Design a protein around this ligand. Structure first.
Ligand SMILES: CCCCNc1ccc(C(=O)OCCN(C)C)cc1
Ligand SMILES: CCCCNc1ccc(C(=O)OCCN(C)C)cc1
Lengths: 159, 159
């Protein structure tokens, strides 16, 4: 209920597969500043379950190393909106996707912390996907933005 | 010779005084990511010498603490262009300023490392100064952008 762009007509099954975290942004610098910042997460693959939950594979820098992680985001009554079981509840929103090239999502908590990423299908700089991302962000109050080049995208934890 | 926007008609004497580093961007993430990143520098005051050199007072996080620093940027034959005596030579460029509200500058080295800041006169979020900054940046290949809120701007090293 900060983010108010969601994608109409979302077919979750078609976001399945390989993704690249091409750009990220967050509402506070410390959500992304360091390599082990809480929301510095690199997406690897999306696996929707037949029941419509979303399994997420990614990487994080945690213990001085690049570690694998698996998250499950459970479906809500809103197709573009999912829920992650954390200590405090955390909504995931799909803002926009064309399935075959890019996907924009944000994660936020119910009571002013927010992070969004531009996911792309391949290790290339997609200018217009980043345009769509920047348009979606201009509303939101972001204070850090990160972008990765094709070299880093082919590296674990984008080193 | 990456940055090709400079300000025509620059009167260096009139940038004198109090500035706030409202936003920064850099060509590589590690130039700004951590609190002690090499180019995470917060500008405090500009002091042009009568001879047209530029003294710069600022703060940096260095030794686990917010430390004062003084730099002098020496004039060149180009009024919007200055030079800092480092190990390797480092050009400072004034892209644009209206003297009384904002100033945009970049620093770069002669052989693909680059950082730019939006300096403002007061601890307020100046939307159009940030617009001008974002327009100036769209050309350049930046990969990290940081923005500070009025609270942090009134704090040493923007904590
Ligand atoms: C279309 C859905 C893409 C969403 N991908 C996501 C990626 C990461 C997260 C997420 O919550 O990661 C941060 C928590 N880590 C540190 C345990 C949540 C969703
Ligand atoms: C209009 C001129 C404003 C320029 N202000 C500047 C601020 C900082 C620097 C600069 O070089 O700072 C980084 C080097 N530190 C870590 C020793 C260079 C110029």
């Amino acid at each position: 209920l900060i983010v108010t762009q969601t994608m109409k007509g979302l077919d979750i099954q078609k976001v399945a597969g390989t993704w690249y975290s091409l750009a990220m942004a967050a509402s506070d610098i410390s959500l992304l500043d360091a390599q082990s910042a809480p929301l510095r997460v690199y997406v690897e693959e999306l696996k929707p379950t037949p029941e419509g939950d979303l399994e997420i594979l990614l990487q994080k820098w945690e213990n001085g190393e690049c570690a694998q992680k698996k998250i499950i985001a459970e479906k809500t009554k809103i197709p573009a909106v999912f829920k992650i079981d954390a200590l405090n509840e955390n909504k995931v929103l799909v803002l926009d996707t064309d399935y075959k090239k890019y996907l924009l999502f944000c994660m936020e908590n119910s009571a002013q912390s927010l992070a969004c990423q531009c996911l792309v299908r391949t290790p290339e700089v997609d200018d217009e996907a980043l345009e769509k991302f920047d348009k979606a962000l201009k509303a939101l109050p972001m204070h850090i933005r990160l972008s990765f080049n094709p070299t880093q995208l082919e590296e674990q934890c984008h080193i």
